[PDB]
Design a protein around this ligand. Sequence first.
Ligand SMILES: Nc1ncnc2[nH]cnc12
Length: 258
Amino acid sequence: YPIINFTTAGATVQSYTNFIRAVRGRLTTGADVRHEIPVLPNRVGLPINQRFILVELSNHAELSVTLALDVTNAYVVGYRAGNSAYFFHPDNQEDAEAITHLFTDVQNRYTFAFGGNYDRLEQLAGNLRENIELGNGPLEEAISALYYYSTGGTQLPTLARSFIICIQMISEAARFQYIEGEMRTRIRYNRRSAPDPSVITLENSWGRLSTAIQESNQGAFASPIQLQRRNGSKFSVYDVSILIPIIALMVYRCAPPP
Ligand SMILES: Nc1ncnc2[nH]cnc12
């Protein structure tokens, strides 16, 4: 499977930008684009040898971990650190089999009894996304936390918190140019801060926005979708047009009409 590297050590807006662009390049194939917005591969009929991509993260502490992302949804399904690999609890039998194809060389593979969805991760971490700071420092720290989990140095809450950080700075950033933009800002001024309502609502609405766009009438939504601006005020989305500079890729929801 393809591998994309990134390091928090000396990270700049440009190195982060190159990273995200590279990830998107490996996620999509250019075969499916609706209203100028790329669509991820359809899970149905997708060969297993084209199912995942790897993201190898390194930090100033000279530690490295490798996350595994499902190309059909950019979902982080697990990670490897040295001689151990951990996978979130699969949603179905098909996904449980698919993951057996990842890190086939690791001496110890473990599957968590819990899922990797925010609801569960926030419960384990004992904090919501709105209260978990994001930025290069948090990522640098998160990479160390994941790395030391097998040895017992990392507590469950801290592991969950760390996943929440990696997922947003990698998966959500790849999905939304807007979120990638918020992370670039944090890196540029080396300032850490929790995600505002605009970020949170976008993360929560990806599936619905993907469906609305794909089932739209020439781009026009049948029903509007409400998002939130940074100050928390409501923002109504009625068309795919206003989302072009915001959403980088969508999950496949339906076939494109003639
Ligand atoms: N594990 C995960 N990977 C990607 N996006 C997610 N959103 C919530 N959990 C996620």
